[PDB]
Design a protein around this nucleic acid. Structure first.
Ligand SMILES: [Mg+2]
Ligand SMILES: [Mg+2]
Ligand SMILES: [Mg+2]
Ligand SMILES: [Mg+2]
Ligand SMILES: [Mg+2]
Ligand SMILES: [Mg+2]
Ligand SMILES: [Mg+2]
Ligand SMILES: [Mg+2]
Ligand SMILES: [Mg+2]
Ligand SMILES: [Mg+2]
Ligand SMILES: [Mg+2]
Ligand SMILES: [Mg+2]
Ligand SMILES: [Mg+2]
Ligand SMILES: [Mg+2]
Ligand SMILES: [Mg+2]
Ligand SMILES: [Mg+2]
Ligand SMILES: [Mg+2]
Ligand SMILES: [Mg+2]
Ligand SMILES: [Mg+2]
Ligand SMILES: [Mg+2]
Ligand SMILES: [Mg+2]
Ligand SMILES: [Mg+2]
Ligand SMILES: [Mg+2]
Ligand SMILES: [Mg+2]
Ligand SMILES: [Mg+2]
Ligand SMILES: [Mg+2]
Ligand SMILES: [Mg+2]
Ligand SMILES: [Mg+2]
Ligand SMILES: [Mg+2]
Ligand SMILES: [Mg+2]
Ligand SMILES: [Mg+2]
Ligand SMILES: [Mg+2]
Ligand SMILES: [Mg+2]
Ligand SMILES: [Mg+2]
Ligand SMILES: [Mg+2]
Ligand SMILES: [Mg+2]
Ligand SMILES: [Mg+2]
Ligand SMILES: [Mg+2]
Ligand SMILES: [Mg+2]
Ligand SMILES: [Mg+2]
Ligand SMILES: [Mg+2]
Ligand SMILES: [Mg+2]
Ligand SMILES: [Mg+2]
Ligand SMILES: [Mg+2]
Ligand SMILES: [Mg+2]
Ligand SMILES: [Mg+2]
Ligand SMILES: [Mg+2]
Ligand SMILES: [Mg+2]
Ligand SMILES: [Mg+2]
Ligand SMILES: [Mg+2]
Ligand SMILES: [Mg+2]
Ligand SMILES: [Mg+2]
Ligand SMILES: [Mg+2]
Ligand SMILES: [Mg+2]
Ligand SMILES: [Mg+2]
Ligand SMILES: [Mg+2]
Ligand SMILES: [Mg+2]
Ligand SMILES: [Mg+2]
Ligand SMILES: [Mg+2]
Ligand SMILES: [Mg+2]
Ligand SMILES: [Mg+2]
Ligand SMILES: [Mg+2]
Ligand SMILES: [Mg+2]
Ligand SMILES: [Mg+2]
Ligand SMILES: [Mg+2]
Ligand SMILES: [Mg+2]
Ligand SMILES: [Mg+2]
Ligand SMILES: [Mg+2]
Ligand SMILES: [Mg+2]
Ligand SMILES: [Mg+2]
Ligand SMILES: [Mg+2]
Ligand SMILES: [Mg+2]
Ligand SMILES: [Mg+2]
Ligand SMILES: [Mg+2]
Ligand SMILES: [Mg+2]
Ligand SMILES: [Mg+2]
Ligand SMILES: [Mg+2]
Ligand SMILES: [Mg+2]
Ligand SMILES: [Mg+2]
Ligand SMILES: [Mg+2]
Ligand SMILES: [Mg+2]
Ligand SMILES: [Mg+2]
Ligand SMILES: [Mg+2]
Ligand SMILES: [Mg+2]
Ligand SMILES: [Mg+2]
Ligand SMILES: [Mg+2]
Ligand SMILES: [Mg+2]
Ligand SMILES: [Mg+2]
Ligand SMILES: [Mg+2]
Ligand SMILES: [Mg+2]
Ligand SMILES: [Mg+2]
Ligand SMILES: [Mg+2]
Ligand SMILES: [Mg+2]
Ligand SMILES: [Mg+2]
Ligand SMILES: [Mg+2]
Ligand SMILES: [Mg+2]
Ligand SMILES: [Mg+2]
Ligand SMILES: [Mg+2]
Ligand SMILES: [Mg+2]
Ligand SMILES: [Mg+2]
Ligand SMILES: [Mg+2]
Ligand SMILES: [Mg+2]
Ligand SMILES: [Mg+2]
Ligand SMILES: [Mg+2]
Ligand SMILES: [Mg+2]
Ligand SMILES: [Mg+2]
Ligand SMILES: [Mg+2]
Ligand SMILES: [Mg+2]
Ligand SMILES: [Mg+2]
Ligand SMILES: [Mg+2]
Ligand SMILES: [Mg+2]
Ligand SMILES: [Mg+2]
Ligand SMILES: [Mg+2]
Ligand SMILES: [Mg+2]
Ligand SMILES: [Mg+2]
Ligand SMILES: [Mg+2]
Ligand SMILES: [Mg+2]
Ligand SMILES: [Mg+2]
Ligand SMILES: [Mg+2]
Ligand SMILES: [Mg+2]
Ligand SMILES: [Mg+2]
Ligand SMILES: [Mg+2]
Ligand SMILES: [Mg+2]
Ligand SMILES: [Mg+2]
Ligand SMILES: [Mg+2]
Ligand SMILES: [Mg+2]
Ligand SMILES: [Mg+2]
Ligand SMILES: [Mg+2]
Ligand SMILES: [Mg+2]
Ligand SMILES: [Mg+2]
Ligand SMILES: [Mg+2]
Ligand SMILES: [Mg+2]
Ligand SMILES: [Mg+2]
Ligand SMILES: [Mg+2]
Ligand SMILES: [Mg+2]
Ligand SMILES: [Mg+2]
Ligand SMILES: [Mg+2]
Ligand SMILES: [Mg+2]
Ligand SMILES: [Mg+2]
Ligand SMILES: [Mg+2]
Ligand SMILES: [Mg+2]
Ligand SMILES: [Mg+2]
Ligand SMILES: [Mg+2]
Ligand SMILES: [Mg+2]
Ligand SMILES: [Mg+2]
Ligand SMILES: [Mg+2]
Ligand SMILES: [Mg+2]
Ligand SMILES: [Mg+2]
Ligand SMILES: [Mg+2]
Ligand SMILES: [Mg+2]
Ligand SMILES: [Mg+2]
Ligand SMILES: [Mg+2]
Ligand SMILES: [Mg+2]
Ligand SMILES: [Mg+2]
Ligand SMILES: [Mg+2]
Ligand SMILES: [Mg+2]
Ligand SMILES: [Mg+2]
Ligand SMILES: [Mg+2]
Ligand SMILES: [Mg+2]
Ligand SMILES: [Mg+2]
Ligand SMILES: [Mg+2]
Ligand SMILES: [Mg+2]
Ligand SMILES: [Mg+2]
Ligand SMILES: [Mg+2]
Ligand SMILES: [Mg+2]
Ligand SMILES: [Mg+2]
Ligand SMILES: [Mg+2]
Ligand SMILES: [Mg+2]
Ligand SMILES: [Mg+2]
Ligand SMILES: [Mg+2]
Ligand SMILES: [Mg+2]
Ligand SMILES: [Mg+2]
Ligand SMILES: [Mg+2]
Ligand SMILES: [Mg+2]
Ligand SMILES: [Mg+2]
Ligand SMILES: [Mg+2]
Ligand SMILES: [Mg+2]
Ligand SMILES: [Mg+2]
Ligand SMILES: [Mg+2]
Ligand SMILES: [Mg+2]
Ligand SMILES: [Mg+2]
Ligand SMILES: [Mg+2]
Ligand SMILES: [Mg+2]
Ligand SMILES: [Mg+2]
Ligand SMILES: [Mg+2]
Ligand SMILES: [Mg+2]
Ligand SMILES: [Mg+2]
Ligand SMILES: [Mg+2]
Ligand SMILES: [Mg+2]
Ligand SMILES: [Zn+2]
Lengths: 83, 208, 99, 99
RNA sequence: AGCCUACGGGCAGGCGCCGAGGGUAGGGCCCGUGACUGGGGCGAAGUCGUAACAAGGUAGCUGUACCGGAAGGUGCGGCUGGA
RNA sequence: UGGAGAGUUUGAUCCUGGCUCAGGGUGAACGCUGGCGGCGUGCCUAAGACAUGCAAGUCGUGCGGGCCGCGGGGUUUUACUCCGUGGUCAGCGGCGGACGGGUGAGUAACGCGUGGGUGACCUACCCGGAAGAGGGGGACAACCCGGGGAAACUCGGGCUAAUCCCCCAUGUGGACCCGCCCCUUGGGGUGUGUCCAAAGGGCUUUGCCCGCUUCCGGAUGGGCCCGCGUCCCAUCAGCUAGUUGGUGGGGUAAUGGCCCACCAAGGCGACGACGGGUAGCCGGUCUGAGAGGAUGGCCGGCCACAGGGGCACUGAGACACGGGCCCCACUCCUACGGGAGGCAGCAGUUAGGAAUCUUCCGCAAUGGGCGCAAGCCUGACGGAGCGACGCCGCUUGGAGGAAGAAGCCCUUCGGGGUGUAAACUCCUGAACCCGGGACGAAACCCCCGAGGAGGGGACUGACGGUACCGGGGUAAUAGCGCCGGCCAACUCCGUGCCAGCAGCCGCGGUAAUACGGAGGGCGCGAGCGUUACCCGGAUUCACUGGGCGUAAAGGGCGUGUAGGCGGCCUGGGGCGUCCCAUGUG
């Protein structure tokens, strides 16, 4: 299926991640459908996370099982939250 | 590495008092006042008509030697000077002057740009409170070049301040000997520096 | 959109097929001067309608055969043998080469 | 050294046979139909055709013959069965055909 | 003739088409090599002459032809880059 | 935001003209030397052959069984078996093994790139909409028995389970023939006829969950098709029988000469066909003022292949690297009947070469497979190891110190140089020691609420006792190229067309700043030089931006084919050309 997950960037020991939608079979750092938001795993700045919640709701709408620790970053941005 | 070898031999090459010593360079010699001629057994014979190369070459020899810097780091800056949109000639110098090992000299905590590097690499310095031992550190505007806390009480540090008392300092700089700190105010304009080098030749030489 | 272009029919021999010659102008990518080149496509003519000397529009279409991947969209005019002249004489000259 | 991919190989062999069996009976049945379809018969030329049209889609359930490839078989079957009867006959017994 | 069958059929097997490649025959291109032979280049001093640069001591050059140890000579035209 | 030139044909001069050098670059290698770190990077050759270890499995919540361990009995008691549960081993069955990882052989091609086409197509798993699951029957492994075999494995005989195979029904629907309308390539709807569905399992069981069947849509991933772009030789000029098209068929998910029968005589080519040589292509990369040239390593996308070659099976998907069958080559086993194997996966070995790494640590993180979950596997990955291979940062000290040590070198014997250099005094404190010591890691999971949205709580770190912090603390590696001109840094001696230098011009034939050593000097500095190759200079293939009276260069002269080019006025179209917008890049 199409999945929403993370992709490594930034040097060795200095990880970053692009939360992105790609085909499950793709390579990790490989070409992807669309970048939604980044995420610093160490918070070296105030901007240690971000999510284009507009389209994120979209892919879940068109079905797109995301990772576990990918869903996590989505709960913090609370794409699922509604009240 | 720096010119760890004899220093006063360099001044004797451009027939110019290159200030790179300290107390002595203001004595009766940067080694100069007794030997206004090049080293080696020769030299003090009838000098040779310098070629366009000879000149433009040695002009660059001064500017670098002045900051006791390596050819590597040196040309990297000149090239970088070429990248940013502005008068490369002068721009270079400003970047060249934003060196931490040089700012500490301009702030006068150190007798020479060499002593300045040692003090810096030894961490005796600090920017905006945080410590720094990288003499290449690009000093930003508004940065506070302060002497490290446990460093203040040192004798050598004091003596260089006992000389920076009252006596003015760079117009793009502010001393504050009381707090034993300092301040990088703004990137110098061409005139604010008085280097014995015509920066235009140094550009020319960088074309081969 | 299905690509389309016009050209002169210059072969009626085949059954339910015709040959269209199409020119295109474009500048030399180093020498500017606009230059012309040409190509022949195999058009599908199921009604055996279009004849020699016809200027016609053809359209990128479902593969009819090995070389046929176009269909004759519509006619443009009949009298155009003048072009068929230049094409044939071009083929005439090849004789005066190989030894 | 011995990956248990054998489980996959032994399985395919069983698979191969089933498909081989379902598929072959498809062919031999269809032949009976076309033979009788031309042979003027129809009281059963169509009766046979049913077991065919059936066995096709039934095989279609399984991973055997699948997709519209199940349809082709049916089309290229009864489409020809009907015509073979057009050699004098008229839609007799209620075959899978609508008049 | 064997096997399975809910007997309507299936599998096994047999034959045919095509088929990796193997074999035979004759062609094409390319590379290496070959007694010997043809000219070419290079050379600090060789043998023979002295054709060219001065009217080069028969003005030169040239296409062709014939001839001569060798440069070359001569015939027929041509050129001036000769007079 | 960019553009420099020099030496060399002469007695000298101008010009043409070739050679040559300074620059930048590299997956480099070689020599001499070599201290610390960080991020990168490392078989370009034989797509040669490989020991060993690991690199793809997973679900007991699909099914029965061997084994071992725990607890109990159905029985008033008992053979023992029934029953509950954990583990293990295979088997049956499901999902994945077509992703991931490696290599450039092949390929001059719709292979790649770029923009489009499909009314000519498929899409496992995920997401949305609708409907449905009634009854009945069967086989084969495991296991039991007997046989053959060295082994690998194998034959026969008998039981049996299921989400395995099968028949009948229900047909929301879908498939097919034919007919009708819409639309218009095979798109949508409708009618009669016929054809096809389903599987159970688990718990807290009157209900929720994971599944199962049919159909439409979505998302994603593809197949095929087309315009245009993509190397050298024309001393390769003609090429073509499935060849070009047609009718009907076979095959596929699907078009097509893909494949076949029949018919027609076509198709391609100087706008370079056919042939030969070479090559994976691109984003990009190196150089250049740019236009241009050169290139495709690491990284991402696409293609191709898995010792050579062919083939199909299974499957949503493959002609499948760690699946299958066959031939050839090679390796090993053998009881000579027969049999096993495939590193261009991670390490490592051997061969070749000028040359290219540890048989390391770990699933903690990210990512992938299976599963309800717990969790299991993962040489993808996350790290560490080795090599100045590259880029970057850093150190071998800082201040003071003679009208100037000794030594060595030169000398007009007065002196000059090395040289503030050292010695010396002072200061700082790489290394080494002491203590503390992570970020990377909050989610699956647990309770409240409903297993949802929302909240709260807990476990988990290979690197690593690492980075970084605080404390204490020793002045503690410098080397290489050059010094006639270009090109810049000079003297002494030895040598004597010998020894040797050399990129060009040239140097040496007893007075060499050109050979070798020394003193001194210049340029770089943990590097410096050399070889190779690319761009530059080269404006020396010149579009930007060159020339042809004598320097190389006008065809011996005509006629003319294609092509190239084309006068003055008006009008239509709007291809080139120009502008805007938008998609794409
Ligand atoms: Mg040094
Ligand atoms: Mg500006
Ligand atoms: Mg065809
Ligand atoms: Mg056709
Ligand atoms: Mg010929
Ligand atoms: Mg079959
Ligand atoms: Mg039969
Ligand atoms: Mg048969
Ligand atoms: Mg019909
Ligand atoms: Mg058979
Ligand atoms: Mg035959
Ligand atoms: Mg054959
Ligand atoms: Mg053959
Ligand atoms: Mg054979
Ligand atoms: Mg043989
Ligand atoms: Mg032969
Ligand atoms: Mg020969
Ligand atoms: Mg020969
Ligand atoms: Mg001769
Ligand atoms: Mg020759
Ligand atoms: Mg001689
Ligand atoms: Mg001679
Ligand atoms: Mg003569
Ligand atoms: Mg003479
Ligand atoms: Mg005469
Ligand atoms: Mg004469
Ligand atoms: Mg004469
Ligand atoms: Mg003459
Ligand atoms: Mg001549
Ligand atoms: Mg002559
Ligand atoms: Mg004659
Ligand atoms: Mg004449
Ligand atoms: Mg005359
Ligand atoms: Mg005359
Ligand atoms: Mg005369
Ligand atoms: Mg006269
Ligand atoms: Mg700029
Ligand atoms: Mg230049
Ligand atoms: Mg010359
Ligand atoms: Mg010369
Ligand atoms: Mg000359
Ligand atoms: Mg001369
Ligand atoms: Mg020149
Ligand atoms: Mg240069
Ligand atoms: Mg090397
Ligand atoms: Mg070596
Ligand atoms: Mg060497
Ligand atoms: Mg070495
Ligand atoms: Mg060494
Ligand atoms: Mg080192
Ligand atoms: Mg570092
Ligand atoms: Mg590290
Ligand atoms: Mg190998
Ligand atoms: Mg091992
Ligand atoms: Mg069990
Ligand atoms: Mg369990
Ligand atoms: Mg389940
Ligand atoms: Mg059991
Ligand atoms: Mg058990
Ligand atoms: Mg046990
Ligand atoms: Mg019991
Ligand atoms: Mg039990
Ligand atoms: Mg497998
Ligand atoms: Mg497989
Ligand atoms: Mg695949
Ligand atoms: Mg070719
Ligand atoms: Mg294309
Ligand atoms: Mg593309
Ligand atoms: Mg898959
Ligand atoms: Mg599933
Ligand atoms: Mg899915
Ligand atoms: Mg789904
Ligand atoms: Mg829903
Ligand atoms: Mg049943
Ligand atoms: Mg029965
Ligand atoms: Mg039963
Ligand atoms: Mg036995
Ligand atoms: Mg036995
Ligand atoms: Mg045996
Ligand atoms: Mg049995
Ligand atoms: Mg049996
Ligand atoms: Mg009913
Ligand atoms: Mg039904
Ligand atoms: Mg119905
Ligand atoms: Mg209905
Ligand atoms: Mg009608
Ligand atoms: Mg409709
Ligand atoms: Mg039914
Ligand atoms: Mg059922
Ligand atoms: Mg089933
Ligand atoms: Mg149930
Ligand atoms: Mg769809
Ligand atoms: Mg979609
Ligand atoms: Mg498509
Ligand atoms: Mg093209
Ligand atoms: Mg050519
Ligand atoms: Mg011929
Ligand atoms: Mg021929
Ligand atoms: Mg045929
Ligand atoms: Mg057809
Ligand atoms: Mg064909
Ligand atoms: Mg056809
Ligand atoms: Mg045929
Ligand atoms: Mg041709
Ligand atoms: Mg060609
Ligand atoms: Mg050509
Ligand atoms: Mg060739
Ligand atoms: Mg190749
Ligand atoms: Mg420009
Ligand atoms: Mg280019
Ligand atoms: Mg590689
Ligand atoms: Mg990289
Ligand atoms: Mg690559
Ligand atoms: Mg192959
Ligand atoms: Mg192979
Ligand atoms: Mg599958
Ligand atoms: Mg299949
Ligand atoms: Mg398929
Ligand atoms: Mg393959
Ligand atoms: Mg393949
Ligand atoms: Mg495979
Ligand atoms: Mg295979
Ligand atoms: Mg392999
Ligand atoms: Mg393998
Ligand atoms: Mg062998
Ligand atoms: Mg054996
Ligand atoms: Mg085996
Ligand atoms: Mg390996
Ligand atoms: Mg070796
Ligand atoms: Mg472990
Ligand atoms: Mg993991
Ligand atoms: Mg993890
Ligand atoms: Mg893994
Ligand atoms: Mg390491
Ligand atoms: Mg290492
Ligand atoms: Mg090295
Ligand atoms: Mg460095
Ligand atoms: Mg010192
Ligand atoms: Mg003195
Ligand atoms: Mg002395
Ligand atoms: Mg000494
Ligand atoms: Mg001297
Ligand atoms: Mg002297
Ligand atoms: Mg000192
Ligand atoms: Mg010294
Ligand atoms: Mg003391
Ligand atoms: Mg301290
Ligand atoms: Mg502790
Ligand atoms: Mg943590
Ligand atoms: Mg934490
Ligand atoms: Mg988390
Ligand atoms: Mg609860
Ligand atoms: Mg809260
Ligand atoms: Mg916790
Ligand atoms: Mg806690
Ligand atoms: Mg820890
Ligand atoms: Mg760890
Ligand atoms: Mg410390
Ligand atoms: Mg202390
Ligand atoms: Mg200390
Ligand atoms: Mg020391
Ligand atoms: Mg050192
Ligand atoms: Mg060095
Ligand atoms: Mg050098
Ligand atoms: Mg020298
Ligand atoms: Mg002497
Ligand atoms: Mg000497
Ligand atoms: Mg001496
Ligand atoms: Mg000699
Ligand atoms: Mg030398
Ligand atoms: Mg001489
Ligand atoms: Mg001498
Ligand atoms: Mg030299
Ligand atoms: Mg010596
Ligand atoms: Mg020296
Ligand atoms: Mg250096
Ligand atoms: Mg070098
Ligand atoms: Mg070279
Ligand atoms: Mg070049
Ligand atoms: Mg030229
Ligand atoms: Mg050239
Ligand atoms: Mg020539
Ligand atoms: Mg001439
Ligand atoms: Mg003429
Ligand atoms: Mg002419
Ligand atoms: Mg002629
Ligand atoms: Mg007009
Ligand atoms: Mg345009
Ligand atoms: Mg646009
Ligand atoms: Zn001085």
């Amino acid at each position: 299926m199409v999945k929403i997950r993370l992709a490594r960037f930034g040097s060795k020991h200095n990880p970053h991640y692009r939360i992105v939608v790609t085909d499950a079979r793709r390579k990790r750092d490989g070409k992807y459908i669309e970048k939604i938001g980044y995420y610093d795993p160490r918070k070296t700045t105030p901007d240690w996370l971000k999510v284009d919640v507009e389209r994120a709701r979209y892919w879940l709408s068109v079905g797109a099982q995301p990772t576990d620790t990918a869903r996590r970053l989505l709960r913090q941005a609370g794409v699922f939250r509604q009240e | 590495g720096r010119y760890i070898g004899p220093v006063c031999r360099l001044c004797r090459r451009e027939g110019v008092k290159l200030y790179l010593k300290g107390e002595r360079c203001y004595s009766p010699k940067c080694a100069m006042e007794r030997r206004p001629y090049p080293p080696g057994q020769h030299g003090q014979k009838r000098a040779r008509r310098p070629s366009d190369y000879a000149v433009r070459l040695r002009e660059k020899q001064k500017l670098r030697r002045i900051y006791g810097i390596s050819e590597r780091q040196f040309r990297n800056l000149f090239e970088e000077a070429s990248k940013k949109k502005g008068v490369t000639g002068s721009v270079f110098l400003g970047l060249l002057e934003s060196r931490l090992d040089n700012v500490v000299y301009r702030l006068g905590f150190a007798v020479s740009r060499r002593q300045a590097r040692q003090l810096v690499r030894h961490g005796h310095i600090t920017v905006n409170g945080r410590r720094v031992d990288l003499p290449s550190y690009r000093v930003r505007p508004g940065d506070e070049i302060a002497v490290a806390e446990k460093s203040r009480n040192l004798e050598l540090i004091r003596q260089n301040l006992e000389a920076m008392k009252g006596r003015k300092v760079g117009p793009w700089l502010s001393l504050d000997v009381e707090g034993m700190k300092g301040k990088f105010l703004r990137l110098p304009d061409r005139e604010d520096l008085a280097l014995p080098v015509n920066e235009q030749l140094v550009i020319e030489f960088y074309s081969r | 959109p299905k690509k389309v272009l016009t050209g002169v029919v210059v072969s009626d021999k085949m059954q339910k097929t015709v040959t269209v010659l199409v020119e295109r102008q474009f500048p030399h990518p180093l020498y500017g001067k606009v230059i012309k080149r040409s190509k022949k496509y195999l058009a599908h003519d199921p009604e055996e309608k279009y004849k020699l000397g016809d200027v016609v529009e053809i359209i990128e279409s479902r593969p009819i055969s090995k070389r046929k991947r176009f269909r004759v969209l519509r006619l443009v005019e009949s009298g155009r043998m003048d072009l068929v002249e230049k094409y044939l004489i071009r083929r005439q000259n090849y004789q005066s080469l190989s030894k | 050294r011995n990956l248990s991919a054998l489980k996959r190989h032994r399985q395919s062999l069983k698979r191969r046979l089933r498909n081989k069996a379902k598929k072959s009976a498809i062919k031999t049945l269809s032949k009976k139909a076309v033979q009788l379809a031309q042979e003027g018969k129809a009281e059963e030329a169509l009766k046979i055709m049913r077991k065919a049209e059936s066995l096709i889609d039934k095989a279609a359930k399984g991973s055997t013959l699948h997709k519209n490839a199940a349809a082709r078989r049916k089309s290229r079957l009864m489409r020809k069965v009907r015509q073979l009867l057009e050699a004098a006959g008229a839609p007799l017994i209620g075959g899978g055909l609508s008049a």
